[PDB]
């Protein structure tokens, strides 16, 4: 929907934080890095574009290269790429069930949304799960050892840049 930035839904009580400042203050308290990058830079032929060429991908990484350098140097990341998921993706179901289950990782999990939507569900330090619902222009870093899972929204499609330390730190520890 129409949200500009990320919003939070707390799990048991169902309450919502939507104000910009409170959202980022809240994520700060949970160790979740949040940044808003200037998505208006993205060329329009790359907006809501889900069948991505090798060229389209390289271009996407070219446009946010500065923002990537800054976050990769501030936080110690090394490599990056682009993935897209949609209803048309073969094995969608059999892929998603890997990130729909609660897992953690031994490195941070960093994603920047370019198109579509996602929801990260993160176990807060007080034991309660909260959602971060992401809009394009949203970069989130989910800290090492934090139990979480991932879900698409009802449009079942997302395009993202993944930033990682090593390929080997991507594994779900269930």
Is 11 annotated in some ligand binding site? no
Is 80 annotated in some ligand binding site? no
Q: Kind and range of the H or E element at 67?
A: helix 65-75
- 104-142 per-residue burial string, b: 16 or more CB within 10 A, e: under 16: bbebbbbbbbbbbbbebbbbbeeeebbbbbbbbbbbbbb
Is 45 annotated in some ligand binding site? no
Is 103 annotated in some ligand binding site? yes
Report the alpha-carbon distance of residue 73 to residue 142 in Å, rounded: 17
Q: Which residue ranges make up the annotated binding site for Ni(2+)?
A: 103, 105, 109, 148
Q: Which residue ranges make up the annotated binding site?
A: 103, 105, 109, 148
Q: Which residue ranges make up the annotated binding site for Fe(2+)?
A: 103, 105, 109, 148
């Amino acid at each position: 929907g129409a949200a500009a930035m990320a919003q939070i839904r707390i799990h048991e009580v169902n309450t919502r934080i939507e104000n910009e400042v409170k959202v980022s203050k809240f994520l700060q308290e949970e160790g979740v890095l949040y940044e808003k990058w200037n998505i208006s830079k993205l060329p329009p032929h790359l907006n809501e574009n889900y069948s991505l060429t090798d060229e389209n991908k390289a271009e996407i990484l070219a446009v946010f290269s500065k923002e990537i350098a800054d976050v990769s140097a501030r936080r110690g990341y090394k490599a990056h790429d682009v993935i897209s998921l949609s209803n048309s993706t073969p094995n969608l179901d059999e892929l998603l069930i890997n990130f729909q289950k609660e897992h953690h990782h031994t490195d941070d999990e960093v994603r920047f949304i370019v198109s579509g939507h996602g929801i990260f569900a993160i176990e807060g330090k007080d034991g309660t799960f909260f959602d971060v619902e992401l809009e394009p222009g949203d970069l989130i870093s989910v800290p090492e050892n934090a139990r979480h899972y991932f879900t698409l929204q009802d449009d079942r499609q997302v395009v993202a840049i993944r930033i990682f330390v090593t390929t080997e730190g991507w594994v779900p520890i269930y």
